[PDB]
Structure formats: C-alpha cells, structure tokens
Design an enzyme around this catalytic site. Structure first.
Site, mmCIF file in Angstrom:
data_model
loop_
_atom_site.group_PDB
_atom_site.id
_atom_site.type_symbol
_atom_site.label_atom_id
_atom_site.label_comp_id
_atom_site.label_asym_id
_atom_site.label_seq_id
_atom_site.Cartn_x
_atom_site.Cartn_y
_atom_site.Cartn_z
ATOM 1 C CG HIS A 157 -2.069 -0.871 1.170
ATOM 2 N ND1 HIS A 157 -2.963 -0.881 0.124
ATOM 3 C CD2 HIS A 157 -2.497 -1.807 2.046
ATOM 4 C CE1 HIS A 157 -3.887 -1.796 0.352
ATOM 5 N NE2 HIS A 157 -3.629 -2.366 1.514
ATOM 6 C CG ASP A 196 -3.742 -7.977 0.956
ATOM 7 O OD1 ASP A 196 -4.668 -7.121 0.854
ATOM 8 O OD2 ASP A 196 -3.129 -8.240 2.024
ATOM 9 C CG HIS A 198 -7.324 -4.690 2.007
ATOM 10 N ND1 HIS A 198 -6.830 -5.533 2.972
ATOM 11 C CD2 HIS A 198 -8.538 -4.287 2.449
ATOM 12 C CE1 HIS A 198 -7.692 -5.619 3.967
ATOM 13 N NE2 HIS A 198 -8.743 -4.878 3.670
ATOM 14 C CG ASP A 287 -5.864 -9.434 3.998
ATOM 15 O OD1 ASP A 287 -5.559 -9.985 2.923
ATOM 16 O OD2 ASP A 287 -5.639 -8.240 4.210
#
Ligand SMILES: O=C(/C=C/c1cccc2c1oc1ccccc12)NO
Ligand SMILES: [K+]
Ligand SMILES: [K+]
Ligand SMILES: [Zn+2]
Length: 427
Positions: A157, A196, A198, A287
């Site tokens: 990120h 992931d 996200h 996740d």
C-alpha cells in the site's frame, strides 16, 4: 548451483513484526518448519536454502529507487521527533513493545496518521522488511534459482511519499525494481499478482505508465472497503494502458467467483506479456481467507492455493523466477495454514523441476479436494489450530458468503461484452 528455493527468514524473526500482528511471523515460521520443510529435508536440503544471514543494512539510499527522499528522511528520524504517548499506553516498560508516539503536524503530509501512526521501532521494522525483500530479489536473480520466499514482506500500500494501510516503504515495488536491474535486458518483463484482500494501490501506482510490469490485483471492492480504489475501469495510462488489471470482488465472495475470475485474468496477463516475461512476484496475503476480521472475502485455503498453483505451474514450464511475498492477514493460524501449503507447493514444484518431471505438485496435498490433512502435531503452536486441527480450517465467516455477482455488477458486464463475442466468433 544453489538450492532452487531460498526461504528468507533472518536471525530475528520479530524484526519485521508489526504491532497489530506481532506474533504472526512466529506462527508462519513454525508452520514452515513442521509442515512444509521436513519432506524436502535430510537443517539441510537440496531443494531449499534456509537463509539466516547476511541481511544487508539498508537505509534511505536503498529505498529512493521508488520513494521520495524527504519522505524517507522523515521516516528515518521520526522516532526522534516526539515522545511516546503515555496516555495511550496502560502497560508500561518492561512489558510493552512498539508503543505509539505522540503525533506531530508534519505527520499529515506523509500519511503517518490513523493506522499508520508512528511507533517506537518503526524505522527498524521498515529496514527489516525492505532488507529481507531486497535479499530475496538478489538471491532470486542468481542462476539455478527458481524462487525466493519472504513471508514477512509485501507492504503493497505504500506510495512514493505517503504511507497507508500499515505500509511505509513499498518493498513490493523496491523488490520488483531490484529484480528488474538484475535480470537479462532481453527478458525482464515482470508480472505481479496481488491476492491480498485489499487493492494493491501502491504497487499499481508505481507502474501505472509502464508496460514492462503488469500489476494484477484481486480484491474486495465496495462502499467502505479499504482503500477505495481498484475498480474495473483502472486499466493503466500511456504506454502502461492494458498493463494494469483489477479484479474487484463483491464483499463476501467465495472461491467460485474469485478463483474463476483470477484464472481468467491471469491467462490474459500471460498473453499481454508474451515471451518477454521473466519473473512473477506474488503478493500473498491471508486476509482474503474466510473468517478474516478486516478482509471482507470468503476464500478457502484451497482456493488461494489453487490460484497460486496456476502461477507456479506456468513459471515451472517456462523456467521463470518466482518472488513470493506475504502481505495482510489478521488471523495468525489462517496465515500460517496458507503460508504452509503455498510454501510446500513451491518446494514440491522446484523438486519436480530438478528431476525433470512435468507433474509439479505430487509432494503437496491439494486442500481443495483433500479435507483431511492434519496440522503437524509437532507444531509449537499446535494447540491453537482447533477446533479442526486440519490445514484447511478457518474461523466462521465474518461476512455472508456470495457465490454470484450482484445484479448490475460491472465485472459481469465487462465479461458480458467479451463473453458473447466468444460464442459468436465460434459460429
Ligand atoms: O491489510 C491491509 C490493511 C488493512 C487496513 C488498514 C487500516 C484500516 C483498515 C484496513 O482495513 C479496513 C477495513 C474497514 C475499515 C478500515 C480498514 N492491507 O493489505
Ligand atoms: K490485492
Ligand atoms: K503497469
Ligand atoms: Zn490486506
């Protein structure tokens, strides 16, 4: 020739640990030692090299390949610029670790707020993460090397001069860049697959205009799902148009959506990159797995393993290099279960390659159809893997399972345009 797999651990596995997932590196390494490694051992092995030194000391100059220098300079001295927040810390030394600092106004420019609050040790944990990934990239570039595995990296990120979603330096981008300079100039296209839960927004932003790095992100997408970007219309810019792919999933999506769509997108990506492809870097968060408190998806361990098996198989056939990184994941046992079977797949695959085989996963159970694999009773953390004590076990779903795209889904519509221009051409 060295062992074809390097597993980058280091001497202090807590060095890169973050405050919210502090114990997670321990579960992961435990599961690797007792589930993935034994069958390829005789620790000594001809399949994998358990890397514990040397870790390069990295500083600002090893991160400027992506990040703005003022931003990095600030991270490297931030712990000198305010005191520990003692109102926030009910447990005091010597029973605390990585406590929050008091914020200062300059934090706002670099996104060092909310989840990215500075803490004592933050620059050391950044150094450990970047150092591990740079070492893994350098070992991967050596001849005879199939894959390098750094479960502790993958801060996808972070942006050029902003932190975000617990990421300060973007070791994915820095690892792609260090790989890039060390691979042959004739064959150095890179595919980076981000599974992931996200949106891999930092990584995508670093390569938006570049057609030699294709970033493919699978991720939950919807109102109030972090970080908000990653819709189907983000396809790249300039020379990079067509080399940014997003697979935004509805909250709660299961394997039947995520796996099918990722298989379809990965084959497109293999095509867009063609024969210039040299390496795949896999950002493998846990996740997305069902039961995660922050990821809002419902993948199974078997589904994630299935996606990654497609990338490993293609890399084995075409003799590519694989850089495997971790990422998010907020259930320790789900993270270690996933890291265990993905790592065992990587080892099994590399062992098959050196023996000339074309069947790559004969030494690693497929959790999509084998629901009886036990967590190794020798695991230090074994007593945490209940109630099932099986390698596919996950906590109860936090969000309802979805098996169909919602009415109006732009993902479906984008399929629709293409999916009927297929049956038409075949007629
Ligand atoms: O693991 C991650 C980051 C997850 C994360 C970080 C900060 C805030 C949130 C995060 O997830 C959320 C979901 C709902 C509301 C807020 C958040 N990246 O890979
Ligand atoms: K992703
Ligand atoms: K790109
Ligand atoms: Zn995540």
């Amino acid at each position: 020739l060295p062992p074809p797999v390097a597993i980058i651990v280091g001497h202090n596995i807590d060095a890169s640990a973050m405050p919210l997932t502090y114990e997670r590196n321990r579960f992961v390494i435990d599961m690797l030692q007792h589930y993935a490694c034994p069958v390829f051992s005789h620790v000594s092995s001809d399949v994998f090299e358990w890397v514990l030194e040397p870790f390069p000391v990295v500083g600002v100059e090893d991160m400027t390949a992506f990040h703005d220098r003022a931003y990095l300079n600030y991270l490297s001295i931030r712990e000198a610029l305010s005191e520990v927040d003692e109102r926030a810390s009910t447990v005091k030394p010597p029973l605390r670790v990585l406590p929050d600092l008091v914020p200062i106004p300059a934090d706002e420019e670099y996104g060092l707020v909310n989840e990215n609050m500075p803490f004592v040790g933050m620059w050391r944990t950044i150094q450990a993460t970047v150092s591990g990934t740079l070492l893994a990239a350098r070992l991967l570039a050596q001849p005879g090397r199939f894959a390098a595995i750094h479960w502790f990296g993958g801060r996808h990120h972070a942006k050029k001069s902003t932190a975000g979603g617990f990421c300060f330096a973007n070791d994915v981008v820095l690892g792609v860049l260090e790989l890039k300079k060390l691979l042959s100039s004739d064959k150095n296209g890179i595919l980076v697959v981000d599974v992931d839960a996200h949106h891999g927004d930092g990584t995508q932003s670093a390569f938006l205009h570049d057609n030699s790095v294709l970033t493919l992100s699978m991720h939950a997408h919807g109102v109030g799902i972090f970080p908000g970007t990653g819709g189907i219309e983000e396809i790249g810019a300039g020379l990079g148009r067509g080399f940014t792919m997003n697979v935004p999933l509805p909250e709660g999506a299961t394997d039947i959506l995520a796996v099918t769509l990722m298989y379809r997108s990965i084959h497109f990506a293999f095509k867009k990159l063609g024969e210039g492809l040299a390496a795949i870097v896999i950002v493998c968060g846990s996740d997305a797995l069902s039961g995660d408190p922050l990821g809002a998806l419902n993948l199974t361990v078997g589904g994630m393993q299935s996606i990654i098996r497609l990338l490993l198989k293609e890399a084995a056939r075409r003799s590519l290099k694989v850089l495997l990184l971790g990422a998010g994941g907020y259930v320790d046992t789900s993270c270690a279960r996933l890291a265990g079977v993905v790592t065992k797949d990587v080892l099994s695959c590399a062992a098959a390659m050196r023996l000339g085989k074309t069947e790559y996963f004969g030494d690693s159970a497929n959790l999509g159809d084998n629901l009886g694999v036990a967590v190794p009773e020798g695991c230090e953390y074994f007593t945490r893997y209940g109630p099932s004590f099986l390698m596919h076990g996950l906590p109860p779903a936090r969000v309802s399972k979805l098996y169909r795209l919602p009415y109006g889904s732009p993902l479906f519509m984008r399929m629709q345009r293409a999916a009927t221009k297929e049956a038409l051409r075949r007629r």
